[PDB]
Design a protein around this ligand. Structure first.
Ligand code: HEM
Ligand code: HEM
Ligand SMILES: C[C@H](O)[C@H](O)[C@H]1CNc2nc(N)[nH]c(=O)c2N1
Ligand SMILES: C[C@H](O)[C@H](O)[C@H]1CNc2nc(N)[nH]c(=O)c2N1
Ligand SMILES: NC(=[NH2+])NCCC[C@H](N)C(=O)O
Ligand SMILES: NC(=[NH2+])NCCC[C@H](N)C(=O)O
Ligand SMILES: [Gd]
Ligand SMILES: [Gd]
Ligand SMILES: [Zn+2]
Lengths: 401, 402
């Protein structure tokens, strides 16, 4: 078992949970690839039994009659149908475990608090839209954000998957210009072009909310416009720099990831969008300041009258901090849930402590957990971490086109 | 067959073919990644020596020459007769530069080809170690126009103990543990401070007392040596617009000189081989001054700046850290002591990655160490995928000699 040290406090733990790691990662004794973003009835039954055992253990009913009965039920379904169906309680447990097991999520202190919408009876893209709107309404809750996941029907043989083509439920369009530059969000140029291909009349703003492209099994994707009253946005202002508001920057309240696959007990849900609330560096540092995103850092530095002709003035650092201040100030002013990187990382340290007692460890991806500004000012920078794959899980999956 | 590596800022993709030549195992397995952990015979010696001699002759474009073959034969014969072998001076220089080039945790490797190598393999005593160390410091400091240097003491050999420098760096500030558990000075150096005291050093009582050297010659107890204060260049810290900052009485030293790592070249081990370059400002301004377990000055600075330290969302920590880093850069520049900011350094490292892709087909790099401890994603290295692996010649950690 790996020995894991916190360098701020000098405390030591052993991650015994890593010994249970299901699937293999990208590293070998010869080289580490930890910094890379994207590195049969019999097998299904094996995963299903592992999951059922896990669940019954969690509710303190291992080797109970109910446990053995459930195992028999699953064996019978698979033998008859080649697959099986989760009880609603198992779906809820599985979704929370997948969040709990996500090594790249710093917000996992909240894992036990998740609203799970069962959309496994969904039949049409039209109904997919209704479920998505209800999710957004619930999760947004007028700015008092609540964590939620909506689970669409599982993958099955001889039927296409349900898919949400958009990477998130709310995203800003990115429009390619004649010179090769982008107006709007460069991260979304591909999905923007697909929306246009499927009949969407594009705007030409910097913050146009994208329509949804929803795919019901074996159908071409269908285009749906989100009602603007459903999409809560926050205009950005700064508490002391009066000109900041004039920049016309804004962002949306609800981070709702919609392109990942949920795996539970060998079953796969290719459409299962989930949402929480934002950590401020996601917006202020990554979305607005990344050179391949909105890339506004230098615009802000010009407005602050910073010396941008020498790196050693640390103009980039100063401009970035004020942008993060503006995000935090603006979300709080607008009464929309947001957490700063210091509070989030402190809660994650608490989570690590909880998980050490509960499970003997916690899979975590250091490069993703440490915030993109002020890294070593947060306690997570000083914490050694072990990264491994546990199931239930959220997995990346190929784009449906 | 080879790891595919993407840069996310630019969208460019390369394959790290050099990784396939990795010479030792790291700590990761397909089951779990330990990349974030800080500290995770004749036939073998001959294989390592032949590989190194081959690297050398390739480096000078004389692969296959009569000189190349003669050296291979000579080394194999020497190992057979003596159990070990000796490097030629030119091989030592090449080997030290390669070890720097190979160091996955160093962001300053654009400079790898410019290294002054002092050959101290003739050293016979701790007194003589001290002479070599003093000369290294004087040369490398160069009145503030810093020059990268390494001094190589005699290699490990059977029948004889090692030369060792007990100190973790040539210049370090004492850390004096107080009764209540607190530390006056640098908490990172409490152990070496206590050992100096155990070995006859009369301690000071300041926050910035330069430690003496504990130098160990083979099969001898360590001996204590005081550095002439005129030899240790220091920089008082002030801030260009926060006038009270100077009154904190902070200072740092010019020369970062790591002295506790082992240099490995062609199977030969040099347990004493201190090296020095120049500082990147975040090492001082962010880590040394702001780590909670180091000087820990962040809150006091923030309060003097009149920041709201009552809630985290004002980002008082971030604002104060940036100004401390500004003070470090301003002060070193004012004192005319070489220093590099994290933006300039990471940009130069990206150039180094490019050079190395063409030259060797890859570059071993430890992402967690390369990305600076403030403003990570504002630097290009944050967006660059990296492959971490071990090549030799190398600088390696080694157990403390006590
Ligand atoms: C409740 C407040 C939450 C906070 C503050 C939070 C925070 C974060 C942050 C900062 C990231 C890094 C994202 C990035 O850099 O792109 C992340 C990733 C992630 N989160 Fe959480 N999160 C929350 C809720 C959730 C929920 C409800 C789920 C699932 C049920 C979840 C699952 C994940 C997954 C799978 C990732 C990895 C995404 C990827 O690989 O691109 N998170 N989270
Ligand atoms: C010339 C200017 C140089 C700069 C700007 C530079 C920069 C850095 C930085 C910022 C680190 C991280 C240190 C830490 O966080 O503790 C580092 C580590 C390292 N550097 Fe360089 N360096 C320079 C010269 C050198 C030289 C001359 C050598 C050897 C000949 C070297 C070899 C190493 C090694 C082996 C490490 C790893 C240290 C450890 O693991 O504790 N560097 N360097
Ligand atoms: C190359 C590197 O792995 C990549 O830039 C990562 C670094 N850490 C990250 N961390 C988070 N939270 N989100 C990210 O998108 C990234 N990007
Ligand atoms: C636990 C973690 O590996 C540790 O804090 C590392 C992170 N990255 C680092 N990076 C550098 N350059 N120097 C360090 O000391 C560290 N410390
Ligand atoms: N806090 C979250 N749940 N984040 C999910 C990822 C959101 C993504 N980083 C974004 O900036 O939109
Ligand atoms: N730039 C260097 N060569 N650094 C070597 C390590 C110095 C160490 N980080 C310090 O703060 O003293
Ligand atoms: Gd102006
Ligand atoms: Gd002032
Ligand atoms: Zn790894």
């Amino acid at each position: 078992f790996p020995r894991v040290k916190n360098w701020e406090v000098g405390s030591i733990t052993y991650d015994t949970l890593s010994a249970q790691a299901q699937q293999d990662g990208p590293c070998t004794p010869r080289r580490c690839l930890g910094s890379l973003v994207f590195p049969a009835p019999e097998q299904l039954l094996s995963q299903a039994r592992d999951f059922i055992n896990q669940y019954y253990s969690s509710i303190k009913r291992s080797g109970s009659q109910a446990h053995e009965q459930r195992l028999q039920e699953v064996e019978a379904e698979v033998a008859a149908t080649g697959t099986y169906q989760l009880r609603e309680s198992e779906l809820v447990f599985g979704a929370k475990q997948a969040w709990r097991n996500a090594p790249r999520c710093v917000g996992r202190i909240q894992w036990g608090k998740l609203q799970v919408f069962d959309a496994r009876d969904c039949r049409s893209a039209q109904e997919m839209f209704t479920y998505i709107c209800n999710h957004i309404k619930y999760a947004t809750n007028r700015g008092n954000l609540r964590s939620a996941i909506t689970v669409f029907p599982q993958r099955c043989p001889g039927r296409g998957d349900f898919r949400i083509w958009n990477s998130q439920l709310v995203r800003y369009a990115g429009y390619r210009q004649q010179d090769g530059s982008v107006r709007g969000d460069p991260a979304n140029v591909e999905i923007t072009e697909l929306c246009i291909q499927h009949g969407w009349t594009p705007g030409n703003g910097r913050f146009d909310v994208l329509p949804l492209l929803l795919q019901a099994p074996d159908e071409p994707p269908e285009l749906f416009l989100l009602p603007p009253e459903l999409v809560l946005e926050v205009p950005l202002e700064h508490p002391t720099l009066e000109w900041f508001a004039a920049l016309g920057l804004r962002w949306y309240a609800l981070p709702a990831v919609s392109n990942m696959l949920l795996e539970i007990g060998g079953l796969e849900f290719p459409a299962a969008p989930f949402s929480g609330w934002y950590m401020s560096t996601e917006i202020g540092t990554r979305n607005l300041c990344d050179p391949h995103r909105y890339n506004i850092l230098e615009d802000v530095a010009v407005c602050m009258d910073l010396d941008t002709r020498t790196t050693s003035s640390l103009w980039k650092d100063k401009a970035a901090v004020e942008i993060n201040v503006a995000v935090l100030h603006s979300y709080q002013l607008a009464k929309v849930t947001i957490v700063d990187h210091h509070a989030a990382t402190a809660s994650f340290m608490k989570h690590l402590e909880n998980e050490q007692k509960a499970r003997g460890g916690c899979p975590a991806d250091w490069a993703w957990i440490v915030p993109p500004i002020s890294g070593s000012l947060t306690p997570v920078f000083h914490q050694e971490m072990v990264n491994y794959f546990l199931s239930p899980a959220f997995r990346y999956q190929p784009d449906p086109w």
